[PDB]
Amino acid sequence: PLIVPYNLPLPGGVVPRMLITILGTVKPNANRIALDFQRGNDVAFHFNPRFNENNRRVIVCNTKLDNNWGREERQSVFPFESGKPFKIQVLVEPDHFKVAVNDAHLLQYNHRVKKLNEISKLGISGDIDLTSASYTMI
Ligand X SMILES: CC(=O)N[C@H]1[C@H]([C@H](O)[C@H](O)CO)O[C@@](O[C@H]2[C@@H](O)[C@@H](CO)O[C@@H](O[C@H]3[C@H](O)[C@@H](O)[C@H](O)O[C@@H]3CO)[C@@H]2O)(C(=O)O)C[C@@H]1O
Sites of contact with ligand X (CB under 6 A): 46, 48, 60, 62, 69, 72
Give CA angle at 133 (80, 128), nearest 5°.
40
| From 1-9, 59-67, 70-78, 106-114, span contacting Cl ion (CB under 5 A) | 106-114
SS3 118: helix
- The reply, when asked if residue 72 is annotated as ligand binding, is yes
Does 81 participate in binding Cl ion (rule CB under 5 A)? yes
**In contact, 39 and 122? CB cutoff 8 Å:** no
- The reply, when asked if residue 75 is annotated as ligand binding, is yes
In terms of CB distance, is 12 or 69 closer to ligand X? 69
Out of 21, 25, 62, 82, point to the residue binding Cl ion (CB under 5 A): 82
Kind and range of the H or E element at 85?
strand 85-92
**In contact, 124 and 132? CB cutoff 8 Å:** no
- The reply, when asked if residue 108 is annotated as ligand binding, is no
The nearest distance, CB 47 to ligand X, in angstroms, is: 10
Secondary structure letter of residue 17 according to DSSP: T
Binding residues, as ranges, are 69-75
